Symmetry: C5
Subunit: 206 residues, 5 copies
Amino acid sequence: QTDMSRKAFVFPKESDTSYVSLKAPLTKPLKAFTVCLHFYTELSSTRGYSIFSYATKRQDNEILIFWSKDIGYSFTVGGSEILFEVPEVTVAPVHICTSWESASGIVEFWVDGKPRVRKSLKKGYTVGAEASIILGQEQDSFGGNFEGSQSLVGDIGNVNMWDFVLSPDEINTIYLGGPFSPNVLNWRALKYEVQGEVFTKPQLWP
Amino acid sequence: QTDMSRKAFVFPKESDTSYVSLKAPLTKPLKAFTVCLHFYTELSSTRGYSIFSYATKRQDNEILIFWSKDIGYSFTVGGSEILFEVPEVTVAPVHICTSWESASGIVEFWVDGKPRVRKSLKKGYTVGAEASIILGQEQDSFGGNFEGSQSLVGDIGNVNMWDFVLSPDEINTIYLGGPFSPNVLNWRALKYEVQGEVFTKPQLWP
Amino acid sequence: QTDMSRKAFVFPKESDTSYVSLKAPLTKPLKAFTVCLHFYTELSSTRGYSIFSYATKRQDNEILIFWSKDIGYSFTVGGSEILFEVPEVTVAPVHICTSWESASGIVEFWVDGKPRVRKSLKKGYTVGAEASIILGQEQDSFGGNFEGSQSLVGDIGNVNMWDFVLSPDEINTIYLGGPFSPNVLNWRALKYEVQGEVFTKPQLWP
Amino acid sequence: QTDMSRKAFVFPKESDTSYVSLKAPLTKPLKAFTVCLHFYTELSSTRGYSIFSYATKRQDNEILIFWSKDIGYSFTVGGSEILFEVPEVTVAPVHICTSWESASGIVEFWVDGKPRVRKSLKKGYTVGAEASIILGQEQDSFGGNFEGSQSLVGDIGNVNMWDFVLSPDEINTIYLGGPFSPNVLNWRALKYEVQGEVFTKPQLWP
Amino acid sequence: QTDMSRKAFVFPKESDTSYVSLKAPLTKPLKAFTVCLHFYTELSSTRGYSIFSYATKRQDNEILIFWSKDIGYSFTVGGSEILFEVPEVTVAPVHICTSWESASGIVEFWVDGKPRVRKSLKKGYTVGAEASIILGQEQDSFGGNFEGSQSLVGDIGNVNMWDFVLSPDEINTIYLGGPFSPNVLNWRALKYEVQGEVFTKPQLWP
Ligand SMILES: [Ca+2]
Ligand SMILES: [Ca+2]
Ligand SMILES: [Ca+2]
Ligand SMILES: [Ca+2]
Ligand SMILES: [Ca+2]
Ligand SMILES: [Ca+2]
Ligand SMILES: [Ca+2]
Ligand SMILES: [Ca+2]
Ligand SMILES: [Ca+2]
Ligand SMILES: [Ca+2]
């Protein structure tokens, strides 16, 4: 494993082959999760891009966080989708956290420390454990079938995952970078595999 | 009793059946009241919603705090209505306090700690104590006849009620969360009954 | 005397009869004056209203402070008028001070602690002491002929008057509420008669 | 001499006769100068006005600081002119400093402590010492031929002049009002004569 | 060598002859570099201008930092160009740092301490050491072929160059002006020749 602290993956070209695959030590289905990350890109006004894609062999979009052009963050689990409208956006590194819970289907979305309204999605579903997690691309098959028009360009980092809904206080400490210990995916202790033209560089955001 | 401190009711789907019923230990008719609450929703640009509905068997809108699309907070007592117009609204958790007094009909409305201009409403009226308090829905009969297009979606909390007009200093301490003791309806010591899909979750607003 | 400190007159309803008459212990004709007050109203976008009317039997507008719709503060002495234009205004409690001096006709106007440009008015005039001061209405006779379309609605308070031009330092102290002692009209030591539907309530502005 | 500290000349009427003549104890021809002053007027959106007019018998505009309607500040020396455009103007007391130097023709313009880009004007010129300095009017003859449509209305003060280019540090101290000692024209040690109605009043700006 | 600290080059007029030529003790070809500078000009709305032109006999735009009218900063190495678009600009002194690295082609651009998204340019190229560095003009031949419509007007200074990519922490130090040692081009110890009318003056920016 690698401690990616203060580092970020840079995807400086649009391509259908620059991606990184992240490995989860996960063996039980997720009844709930939280995923938090920084990403920085200018694409937001030109086209959509996949921020974070979680797929399982039965489901290519088992979790997907997706910017949709002039709409905002698509969030979807089990292929079903909700929009968190972002009517205007400024070019700056954006931190997000997002969390989901089968027991209620409550989705929380958090942008730069501010909560979005809780919404309902896929109540009672379960997210499969056998996951191909990929950054930089949107995958339409397990680990593959990328689309260049959906690749990310720019940076992504601090990618952390918990198998539970972080409380708003926890989310606040994440945004401020207080001490925390993810247990599904941990940027301090990441296991990953890099494919194509991708670079690791010091993070631009503080 | 339940101490709902740090908790909010989440109404994640539009429906005609998600509501909570709040019980007041009230027997004296109200010559005056103050009601203060937090709510968070995105509906404000799309459609109206009930924020707080107080009914009595003679009067389905005995007190109603309502958002009317592109107008603002409708406030009404005994069915008579006034508008505190809000020409720009931003998606953030909004605190309101509102206070009324039979002796003068003075309505005070207070959004996020800022007073709206005092207005006159229903001077000399009285608000009945034989009351059904409902959150999440607008009731057109004592405890029912909800209209889904008027339900709340998102969150509501800190729902507190006093049988007197809180002074501006008191309302300031409410907005800052100083110590206070509601005596009609107390969020730290609430009696409530939940129906349908409604969840209790950590409050998103601080 | 009444100590109106922390109190304000509330004019919650449009009428041609809600007014308060303020009594000045004044017998010297004024060569100069300063008047400072808090008022709060939403009328500013809909219609004009009198903020402060000082009349004498030969002159119904001996001093008038008047909001004129989409123009701003009309200020007039001895019927002669000037405008301190306000091209856009926001609904907040607004403090004004204004000062005039026969020796020069220099009018000072101050809004929320900011000076407006000094303008000339009625150089060499004098303001009669045999005066009726009314809040909530505009006089067209020495105590009457009000027009409801010119009444104030909302609140007015801290109405203080000096028979001299306060220095900018003094006016700063007023706006911050430092210690000051008016000598024509003192809100801590006011003499007034209330008429019609008018109430005294705690001031909304700090 | 008069110590005009904390005082300003008030020009409350448009006229072709109200002006102040300032006397400089100056005999050496100026190879460089700095002028700093506060002025406050609403004319900026209605019409142009002279801020500061320095003439010599050869040349009516030997130094002119001028506001030209919707263009901004006009700075001219020896009749030749440059513009420091101001597309957005707000009604507030505006401090300026302006410096010029024959050796380079570098003009510095400073507004409210912010530098404008250095520009070239009249390299190798020299400004005559046999000078008439007038505030409130623009002169087209050594002490006259004013035009009312070019008079200033409002206030002017802290009019200081140095026979050298103040460094940016010096100009910063001026804007903050630190210790400084002008040697061509000193507001703290002014020689002047007032003509027409012009009033000395306490400065409205701090 | 001249310690240009606190000084800036002033280019007060548009011309095809105002330039300064900067000398580097450089003999190894650059696999990477960082260049940081302050410049101040109003041209940004009127026309494009050179900010920093580095040329080699084989390549007239071996590094060029350029403003493209209504586009933003053009950055190019080896004659190939990328845009860091700036949709709205305000007239203030702007600090930039920009860095490039042959190993990846990662271009970093930083404006006033804020990072632009990393982009890919000329991966695997190398910047020649036998270089003519010119400020105030864009070269089209080694040391010459200037075009007046592309000259800079205003100020440039603190021009520093490193033969490596400064980390974001380093660049933050530069923007705050902490201690640093450039090793290709050092403003504290600059070697240069001035041609035409260019002046050294105290820097306007802090
Ligand atoms: Ca897909
Ligand atoms: Ca796809
Ligand atoms: Ca109803
Ligand atoms: Ca209904
Ligand atoms: Ca009248
Ligand atoms: Ca009238
Ligand atoms: Ca002239
Ligand atoms: Ca003229
Ligand atoms: Ca070229
Ligand atoms: Ca060229």
